[PDB]
Design a protein around this ligand. Sequence first.
Ligand SMILES: O=C(O)C[C@H](NC(=O)OCc1ccccc1)C(=O)O
Ligand SMILES: [Ca+2]
Ligand SMILES: [Ca+2]
Ligand SMILES: [Ca+2]
Ligand SMILES: [Ca+2]
Ligand SMILES: [Zn+2]
Length: 316
Amino acid sequence: ITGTSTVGVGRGVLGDQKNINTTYSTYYYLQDNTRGNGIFTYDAKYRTTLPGSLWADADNQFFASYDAPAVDAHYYAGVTYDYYKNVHNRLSYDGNNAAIRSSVHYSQGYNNAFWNGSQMVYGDGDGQTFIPLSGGIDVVAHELTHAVTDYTAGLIYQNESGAINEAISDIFGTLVEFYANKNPDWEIGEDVYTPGISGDSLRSMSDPAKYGDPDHYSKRYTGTQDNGGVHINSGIINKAAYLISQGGTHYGVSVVGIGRDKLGKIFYRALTQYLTPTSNFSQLRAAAVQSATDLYGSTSQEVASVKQAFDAVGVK
Ligand SMILES: O=C(O)C[C@H](NC(=O)OCc1ccccc1)C(=O)O
Ligand SMILES: [Ca+2]
Ligand SMILES: [Ca+2]
Ligand SMILES: [Ca+2]
Ligand SMILES: [Ca+2]
Ligand SMILES: [Zn+2]
């Protein structure tokens, strides 16, 4: 809606206090006018009708436990916006500053989050497997990254192209986690996953096999569950991306790490200029090699590391 830009203060899902950009018009709304065409956060009110109600608050203060997921979805959307803009010169997910919309309190005990083709959507979780999912910055950025991929490479959500889709969201979710620099790591979902158990997560890029996910092509899943294993075989690519950045020896293949920034650069370029909707793992390797070549030259260390990492995970 129309109104004045203001600044609220609230607490996130993990009890942390933070400032949020709000909009004032009778009520204080979760509308950030500082970023692109705006970031809008809605209340789905435990139902599944979307988007639900633009979040309205009487006093620009967001400390109620009910507020917390909206606080983080709003804040973390802004962080992710900043990453793509400051790091990749990308303006929102479509490159033209499209409004970013998120709904929270979707359904009841909903242990999931997603991009619905138009907006982000976060369950509260059931309190056992998940607490409210927007509490995880790598979750928020994974989801918004799905929007980026949809507008760019458009990787179809199935089989190897689908697993590439997932890895890209896991890669950029992690890189955004590092960008904000609060407890960053190469795990996925640790901040909102299983509040009863410390140290675990939904998936691991550093060691996919920690959670039953393949870390080598020879161990790929070939059946039909999970749209041909898009959340499973992503481990192969997650591990490759981990290797490219951090380095290491994997199945006896040594990889010289080149760090986060360049991993980001190579993959962002791969995603936006070389991947197509039907790209398989093998074409992803080629896309990444050509991206590293464009950026650093065909005889560079960067190129040699991309090749070593994909060799390491068994992708030719
Ligand atoms: O299948 C979909 O499109 C929805 C699925 N959602 C999902 O896995 O929710 C939990 C979660 C999300 C991001 C990071 C860690 C955990 C996805 O985004 O892949
Ligand atoms: Ca309030
Ligand atoms: Ca973390
Ligand atoms: Ca993480
Ligand atoms: Ca846990
Ligand atoms: Zn995903």
